[PDB]
Amino acid sequence: TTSQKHRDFVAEPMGEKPVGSLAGIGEVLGKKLEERGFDKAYVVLGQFLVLKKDEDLFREWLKDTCGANAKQSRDCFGCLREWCDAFL
Amino acid sequence: TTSQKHRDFVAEPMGEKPVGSLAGIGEVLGKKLEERGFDKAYVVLGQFLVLKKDEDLFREWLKDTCGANAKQSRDCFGCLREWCDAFL
Amino acid sequence: TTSQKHRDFVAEPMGEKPVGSLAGIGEVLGKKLEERGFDKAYVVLGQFLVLKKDEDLFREWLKDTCGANAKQSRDCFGCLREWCDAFL
Amino acid sequence: TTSQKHRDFVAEPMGEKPVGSLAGIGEVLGKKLEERGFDKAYVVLGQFLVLKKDEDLFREWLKDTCGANAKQSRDCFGCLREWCDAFL
Amino acid sequence: SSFSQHARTSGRVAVEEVDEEGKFVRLRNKSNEDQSMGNWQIKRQNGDDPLLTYRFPPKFTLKAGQVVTIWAAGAGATHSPPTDLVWKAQNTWGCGNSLRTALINSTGEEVAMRKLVRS
Amino acid sequence: SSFSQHARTSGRVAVEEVDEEGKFVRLRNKSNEDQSMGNWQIKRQNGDDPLLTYRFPPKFTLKAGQVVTIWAAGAGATHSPPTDLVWKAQNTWGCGNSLRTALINSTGEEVAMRKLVRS
DSSP, X not given: OOOHHHHHHHHSOOTTOOGGGSTTOOHHHHHHHHHHTOOSHHHHXXXXXXXXXXXXXXXXXXXXXXXXXXXXXXXXXXXXHHHHHHTO | OOOHHHHHHHHSOOTTOBGGGSTTOOHHHHHHXXXXXXXXXXXXXXXXXXXXXXXXXXXXXXXXXXXXXXXXXXXHHHHHHHXXXXXX | OOOHHHHHXXXXXXXXXXXXXXXXXXXXXXXXXXXXXXXXXXXXXXXXXXXXXXXXXXXXXXXXXXXXXXHHHHHHHHHHHHHHHHTO | OOOHHHHHHHHSOOTTOBGGGSTTOOHHHHHHHHHHTXXXXXXXXXXXXHTTTOHHHHHHHHHHHHOOOHHHHXXXXXXXXXXXXXXX | OOEEEEEEEOSSOEEEEEOTTSXXXXXXXXXXXXXXXXXXXXXXXXXXXXXXXEEOOSSOEEOTTOEEEEEEGGGOOOOBTTTEEEETTOSOOOOOSEEEEEEEOTTSOEEEEEEEEEO | OOOEEEEEESSSEEEEEEOTTSSEEEEEEOSSSOEEOTTOEEEEEETTSOOEEEXXXXXXXXXXXXXXXXXXXXXXXXXXXXXXXXXXXXXXXOOOSEEEEEEEOTTSOEEEEEEEEOO
């Protein structure tokens, strides 16, 4: 169904959690994106908002900015979209 | 210091308020930003997150994206920053 | 306990509200009181004050002036009493 | 211009002051007003309000009710008018 | 439970519990300081149903860690201030797939919230 | 004006204006630095009338040069921090020939006071 880390993140507002706290974001991709400049989750979500929450564009950009596969990109997009539906 | 519209936007979660709901944003600038794609306050706040809360960069971007003056740019930046401090 | 019209009347000073704005005064009662000469709320209150704020005297006067029964007279007397307590 | 009793009456809400507490009303005038039915200062104020705050009407009423002269009637009218302007 | 629970709280009092049948709404002063909730307002949203607003007394205090449970009229409980209150003015707090409750303080500001979302 | 005003200040905040009908209380921070007035107490004395005690929220700071006016319930004003606040718990600040408004800090110390005296 849903990853538990996803449930933990969507349970509460993102606040100031690192991008690694995002569901489907492990140390490899998290470090990649932090070096890319997306060192925090809220900047990444703003990109997701900037991408107007589109699944395809967001997932493709995420892969091109770190290398997330279809599974990882799908999970991250789902977590962000659910959090937006919950708190945004 | 602050307008009542600014406080009303800040006093509550942004939800799905239009870009015009932002402080210092009237019909002309809000319509321009909607033309640019920023059709909602959440898109602008996501841009602000991507901007990582820089005042000068955010205000310059707003001026280049809708022709806002220092007044309107300052009002919008203050409103978004306060909303972030409250809810983010 | 307290009627909404009564709450609205007591929340603010009566000022120059018509007799119809009084609690327990309908359209027929308001028109009758206007025809009798008590065309305004404050004149009716003064008549109530002329009767030394007596419940029985004021209710009997209202009944003989417009035709109020127990409930209407009680509501009007309570409204005037609470207005006197709040402001007078 | 005004007696000390006038200042004392005006400076505070009338509440339940006797008819004698009115400015320019003596013991005999107050007793006569009580005999006629105006046994309290607020009764005299209600009579004054019924007369729609007319100076000549109030002075004539006081003269015909308690035998107050021009000076006493003028003082009482001024006291009631100032009280109305201060509180009503 | 099929009702995903989403809570947000920025003050000393959080939404301790929400009754799915709308019998009560339960909060806690999860801080270590007694919280004064004078004139505070409770706004309950049940999906698309109209908002129900309950207001605290002008001077009401919820002590640290204490439980305040506002019962509806149909709850059948007895109010025991400052621990139990029964909102006899509201028969039921309502039901629905989107049960979100926002607590509004004396200054008309939301500081705590819980939303229950069902598929 | 028939109401003599006595102004005294040893801190940064001075009592700018007092309403004779008790509709509002106005204070001014005449220094060049913001004054934090968290939980400061305002005590209003109307001659021999019982003291009316007003307490600010736990965290409140007045910016330098700004004006905050404390309005009463009978005034009908609308609160708007950090510049406008309304005390609904009190209908009016009171009236009388000897109106004394004393600003008391969180430490129970008098730092400002303005007294309205009428002959």
